[PDB]
């Protein structure tokens, strides 16, 4: 197992996307002892919804000891992402290939005129860093078109919005836009960017 590819997952709240990430992707990585870092921006006072999947790294001991990491991003900042990314590259030096999971990728990967060096590395040199990416977002146009060009896999849950379908067809795949509107609840469509193939998946157990 060497997960250094880029997966984008698109789905609204309650689409079932959270279950796919938290009850499939993260547990599979843990099971195969693949390290990961989760970037979470959801300030709940009960704390991160990802707290059971990893540790908040604070001390020197944490730095060398904690393979599964949760980061609370209060900043949602380009300054923050450079630290997160530079940190992840070193995390992979320590633990081997690692996966950076971004819970609401809009904050870092939304449209910007001047794309920061780290974001550029994330999208164009991720396999050199040994960092796979899972970018989660609610709506397809939340993210720069370049993200979908650079992705290996694009996972989509049902959407009705005409704005979304036309965006999908324009920037990703017309066939995907056609089949996404046919998805039953919790079903998800997977577009493989490298094979140009679309598969519909049944809901996770």
User: Min. distance of Cβ 160 from Zn ion in angstroms?
Assistant: 28
Backbone angles phi and psi of 164, in degrees to 5: -70, -45
Q: Which residues bind Zn ion (CB under 5 A)?
A: 39, 73
Q: Is 39 annotated as a binding residue?
A: yes
User: Min. distance of Cβ 85 from Zn ion in angstroms?
Assistant: 10
**CA-wise closest residue to 38 among 77, 70, 66, 7:** 70
Q: Is 41 annotated as a binding residue?
A: yes
Q: Between β-strands 36-40 and 6-10, what pairing exists: parallel, antiparallel or unpaired?
A: unpaired
Our CB check for Zn ion shows the closer of 84 and 189 to be 84
User: Min. distance of Cβ 39 from Zn ion in angstroms?
Assistant: 4
CA angle, 102 then 182 then 154, to 5° = 25
136 forms beta bridges with 9
Our CB check for Zn ion shows the closer of 2 and 56 to be 56
130 with 97: CB under 8 angstroms? Answer: yes
Q: Is 103 annotated as a binding residue?
A: no
Our CB check for Zn ion shows the closer of 123 and 177 to be 123
Our CB check for Zn ion shows the closer of 142 and 164 to be 142
What is the rounded distance in angstroms from the CA atom of residue 135 to the CA atom of residue 17?
Answer: 11
Binding residues: 39, 41, 73, 108
Binding site members for Zn(2+): 39, 41, 73, 108
């Amino acid at each position: 197992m060497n997960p250094d590819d880029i997966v984008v997952i698109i789905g609204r709240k309650r689409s079932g996307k959270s279950y796919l990430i938290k009850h499939y992707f993260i547990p599979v990585l843990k099971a195969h002892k693949i390290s990961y870092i989760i970037d979470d921006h959801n300030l709940l006072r009960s704390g991160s919804e990802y707290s059971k999947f990893g540790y908040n790294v604070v001390t020197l001991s944490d730095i060398v000891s904690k393979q599964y990491v949760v980061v609370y991003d209060r900043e949602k900042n380009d300054v923050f992402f450079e630290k997160l990314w530079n940190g992840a590259k070193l995390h992979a030096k320590k633990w081997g290939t690692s996966v950076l999971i971004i819970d609401e990728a809009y904050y870092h990967f939304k449209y910007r005129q001047k794309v920061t060096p780290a974001i550029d590395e994330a999208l164009h040199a991720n396999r050199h860093a040994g960092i796979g990416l899972i970018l989660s977002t609610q709506r397809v146009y939340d993210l720069m078109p370049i993200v979908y060009k650079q992705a290996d896999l694009i996972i989509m849950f049902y959407t009705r919005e005409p704005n979304e379908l036309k965006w999908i067809s324009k920037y990703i795949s017309t066939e995907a836009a056609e089949k996404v509107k046919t998805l039953k609840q919790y079903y998800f469509l997977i577009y493989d960017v490298n094979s140009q193939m679309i598969k519909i998946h049944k809901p996770i157990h």
